[PDB]
Structure 1
Amino acid sequence: SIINFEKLGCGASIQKTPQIQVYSRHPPENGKPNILNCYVTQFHPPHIEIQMLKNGKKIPKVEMSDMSFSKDWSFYILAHTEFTPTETDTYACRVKHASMAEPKTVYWDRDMGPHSLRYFVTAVSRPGLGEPRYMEVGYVDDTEFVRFDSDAENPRYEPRARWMEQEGPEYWERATQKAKGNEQSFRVDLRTLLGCYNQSKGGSHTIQVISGCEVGSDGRLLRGYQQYAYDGCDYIALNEDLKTWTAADMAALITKHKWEQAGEAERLRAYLEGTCVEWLRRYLKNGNATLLRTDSPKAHVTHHSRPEDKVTLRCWALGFYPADITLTWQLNGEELIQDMELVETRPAGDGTFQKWASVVVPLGKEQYYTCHVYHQGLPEPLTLRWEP
């Protein structure tokens, strides 16, 4: 259950480039249906235009994940489409974002204990286009379980995991009413934050909040979260002592002084140490059978030719959950660094993740190199080599 936010009341009166990965959900095989993914990360503002193209022309029906953001405040989204790869068909993903002068096109290259209840809140103004879009997203251990989107005719809190369907009508009635009330606070804050930052009146701006609690195995609060951001940059945040605030620039000092007089830090300490802890307990019970799952990575090495007498050994890790993983290449019992390339861990689209690490080795010396895969679901790290 999310907290009821207090208005920032700041007073009276920078863009990030997306990063793109284009890859198939499964290893591509000509003639075998698959899924083409376009994974876009690290961008801000959140408005983004994504097209998937086959042989230059726009693919008609592409699906999009709902947009989320990470702890660095940047946004990410997964676009995917169904496709059957061939040897000559060319696929690409084109992303149009304000941070770039020109749309970016990235082509598909076949070689490409503690628990937590946290709420990710977004309020984006779109002056002229309508009212600000407001969203509340709840996570039980990185797993989304509830969602509120004001961009509907009759916006309501919705279960996002089947185990949340047990909550009676009274739970969803009050959660939605809190969201609509919370939406109003961010509507007012968006308006006044304009003059506090000396910004023109016609642009789009965002407020982001991360609110929640991390609870150890003993049921005690490990860490409480209450962090605000305006336009993708730190604004104010409750400190680890849960008693004082860290304001990130001059505008946030009015909010900090106002919240000290109002005793807001103590209101949140009561929410985090209490209400947040007890609700996470109720949520964990309903989702016990599904939330604690771990999927071990399955690994394999592929072999790719290079100029002159070099080859590329690419070590794949597929179908693993959670996302955290480590891939290393070794020669003579020592770990390699210099000639080794990575990709950021990326979703497959089915709940599991993928990653690979490659290394350039001399031709004929492939059996001198061993890849190592470290994952929490593996009883012992995987070791494997290129096998023709």
Structure 2
Amino acid sequence: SIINFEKLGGGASGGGGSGGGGSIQKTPQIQVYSRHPPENGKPNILNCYVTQFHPPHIEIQMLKNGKKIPKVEMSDMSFSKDWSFYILAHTEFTPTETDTYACRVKHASMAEPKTVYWDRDMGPHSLRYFVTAVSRPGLGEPRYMEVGYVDDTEFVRFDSDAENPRYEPRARWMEQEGPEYWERETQKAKGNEQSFRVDLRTLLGYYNQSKGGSHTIQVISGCEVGSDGRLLRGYQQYAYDGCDYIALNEDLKTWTAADMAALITKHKWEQAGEAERLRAYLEGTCVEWLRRYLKNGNATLLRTDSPKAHVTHHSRPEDKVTLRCWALGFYPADITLTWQLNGEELIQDMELVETRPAGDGTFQKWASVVVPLGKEQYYTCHVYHQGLPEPLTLRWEP
């Protein structure tokens, strides 16, 4: 159960100033890949994973031979610890030897759209809420969202852009909670929504910004609990336009304000004793709810799926070749892939991609290294996953 938020601003706006402000935007990183190994003629799923962008508004199109693919599905949007957003776009497809596919992304951080082609060669716990409020002048009321996570597993979601906004279960095990729980969570969310709507208007003034620009307020609120049931860390962090604004310090008593706008909120919260209110929520209410969700999600939550791995071989200009170590279908996402030459790790020359979702709940990752042609048998790939009884060792097999 997410906390009921206290407004960041004093209420009254103004701050005689317009067209005086705006922060850096973050460029999207893109990966295009199939869910399953690509076999010509076999239906598969093609993914376009877009991460690290800010603001949240983004346009994604998937292309087949240069033409827009009409039926492209989009996952709900989320954001990570660094405040940057991520989303997965996917479409069904049956790959062929000669059909080219690509993913095109339009985002304010870039001058023109970016097209990325599909290259098909060869023991604690935490309850955290990720909150997003995005103003959108002209296009309507601000979009407000509350997303809940038990150990990085999304389990509840409230989105104001739904037809009649309501908290929804995102894991089957939350279906146990009765009507009173959902009703109370839904009403608290709508109350929180109003708080952020007012803060959006107020911070617009604190930063002397134009009235027609879209801005974002984000929050990460929650608790990390040790196996002994004791609070390990409490979180109450805010960002404005993707940059730190204010956060409760580890002492659960004082605040760290990132700029002068935030000092106004800090002073306001110190006088009202907001830190004490959060400390109580973080050490009590948050921990109690986390225990209740862990109980209900028991049989589902702890589970792990070890990576199925293998090595692929690819030509490089002249006497060099690339060995690519693949780790597929694993869960959770945490994993380590390394290449060794003579029992020694070659981290400083490996090429790797950020771990990514297959779209079926599992993850994928690969690490590669360039080696002399004919020396492939001198290298070994090591896959360390928490689901592995023992770290895996693989070699290229011809």
SS at match of 1:106: strand
Structure-1 separation of matches of 2:265 and 2:344: 53
| CA distance in 1: counterparts of 2:11 and 2:314, whole angstroms | 60
Instruction: Indicate if the aligned counterparts of 1:10 and 1:196 stay in contact, CA closer than 8 A.
Output: no
1:366 aligns with 2:376: yes
After superposing the two structures, state which structure 1 stretch, 180-189 or 320-329, moved more.
320-329
Q: CA deviation at 1:11?
A: 6.9
Question: Partner of 2:366: helix, strand, or coil?
Answer: strand
Kindly indicate whether the alpha-carbon contact (under 8 Å) linking 2:305 and 2:329 is maintained by their aligned counterparts in 1: yes
User: Deviation per CA, 1:176-208, whole angstroms, max 9, x where unpaired?
Assistant: 000000000000000010110011110000000
1 CA distance for matches of 2:280 and 2:129? 17
Deviations 1:212-267 (A, max 9, x none): 00111111100000000000000000000000000001100010011001000000
8 Å CA contact retained: 1:303, 1:386: yes
Q: Taking every aligned residue pair, what percent have the same amino acid on both sides?
A: 99
Is 1:182 aligned to 2:171, yes or no?
Answer: no
How far apart in 1 are the matches of 2:187 and 2:350?
Answer: 52
| 2:207 counterpart residue number | 197
Cα pair 1:50 1:93 within 8 Å, conserved: yes
3-state DSSP of counterpart to 1:183:
helix
TM-score, normalised via structure 1 length: 0.98
Using the TM superposition, give the Cα deviation of residue 335 of structure 1 relative to its aligned residue in structure 2, in angstroms. 1.1
Task: Write the mapping of 1:85-104 to structure 2, written as runs, cut at 5 A.
Answer: 85-104=95-114
2:333 and 2:363 in contact (8 A); partners too: yes
For the 8 Å contact 1:10–1:193, the answer to whether it is kept is no
CA contact (8 A) 1:10 1:251 kept: no
The offset of 1:112, in angstroms, is 9.4
Q: Distance in 2 between matches of 1:298 and 1:218?
A: 33
Q: Single out whichever of 33-42 and 9-18 deviates more from structure 2.
A: 9-18
- Checking the alignment, whether the CA contact within 8 Å between 2:122 and 2:312 is kept in structure 1 is no
- Pick from 262, 283, 286 the counterpart of residue 293 of structure 2: 283
The structural deviation recorded for 1:339 is 3.4
Deviations 1:121-140 (A, max 9, x none): 00000011100000000011
Q: Name the SS of the counterpart of 1:170 in structure 2.
A: helix
SS at match of 2:181: helix
Residue 153 (structure 1) shift: 2.6
Secondary structure, counterpart of 1:252 in structure 2: helix
Correspondence for 1:5: 5
Aligned to 2:173, what secondary structure does the other structure show? helix
| Equivalent residues of 1:23, 1:112 under 8 A apart | no
Shift of 1:323: 1.0
Greater shift, 337-346 or 268-277, is seen at 337-346
Query: Equivalents in 2 of 1:137, 1:328: separation in Å?
Result: 34
Q: Deviations over 1:364-388 (max 9, x none)?
A: 1111110110111111100010001
**1:45-83 deviations in whole A, cap 9, x for unaligned?**
000000000000000101111000001000000001111
How far 1:307 sits from its partner (Å)?
A: 1.2
Q: 3-state DSSP class of the match of 1:287?
A: helix
Decide which moves more: 201-210 or 325-334.
325-334
Kept in 1: contact 2:350–2:367 (CA 8 A) = yes
Query: 1: distance between equivalents of 2:257 and 2:126?
Result: 25
| Counterpart secondary structure, 1:251 | helix
TM-score (norm 2): 0.96
Contact 2:338–2:381, Cα closer than 8 Å, also in 1: yes
Contact 2:122 2:314 (8 Å CA) reproduced: no
Equivalent pair of 1:11/1:196 in contact (CA under 8 Å): no
SS at match of 2:260: coil
Q: Residues 267 and 300 of structure 1: is their aligned pair in 2 closer, same or farther, counting only changes over 3 Å?
A: same
**Is the contact made by 1:34 and 1:85 (CA closer than 8 Å) also made in structure 2?**
yes
| CA displacement 1:110-155 (0-9 Å, x = unmatched) | 1492111100000000011100000000011111111101112311
Q: Does the 8 Å contact 2:11/2:198 carry over to 1? A: no
Distance in 2 of aligned mates of 1:348 and 1:264 = 42
Structure 1 window deviating more from structure 2 (106-115 vs 272-281): it is: 106-115
C-alpha contact (below 8 Å) 1:22/1:112 kept by paired residues: no
Tell me how far 1:10 sits from its aligned partner: 5.5
CA deviations 1:300-319 (Å, max 9, x no partner) are 00011111111110000001
In structure 2, relative to structure 1, the CA distance for the partners of 1:112 and 1:248 (3 Å cut) is farther
**Structure 2: 5+ residue runs without aligned partners?**
13-22
1:84 maps to which residue?
94
Distance 1:337 1:160 in 2: 38
Q: 1:79-115 deviations in whole A, cap 9, x for unaligned?
A: 0111111110000000000100100000000149211
Contact 2:132 2:216 in 1 (8 A): yes
Please say if residues 310 and 325 of structure 2, whose CA atoms lie closer than 8 Å, have aligned partners that are also in contact.
yes
- Contact 1:73–1:229 (Cα < 8 Å) also in 2: yes
CA change 1:233–1:10 in 2 (3 A) is: farther
Would you say the 8 A contact 1:11–1:254 is kept in 2?
no
- 3-state SS, counterpart of residue 48 of structure 2: strand
Shift, 1:324, TM fit: 1.1
- Unaligned runs of 5+ residues in structure 1 are none
Q: How many residues align?
A: 388
Q: Contact 1:41–1:76 at 8 Å: present in 2 too?
A: yes
Shift of 1:338: 4.1
Distance, in Å, in 2 between the alignment partners of 1:10 and 1:43 is 30
Give the CA deviation at 1:340.
1.8
SS at match of 1:268: helix
1:318, 1:354 within 8 Å by CA — same for their partners in 2? yes
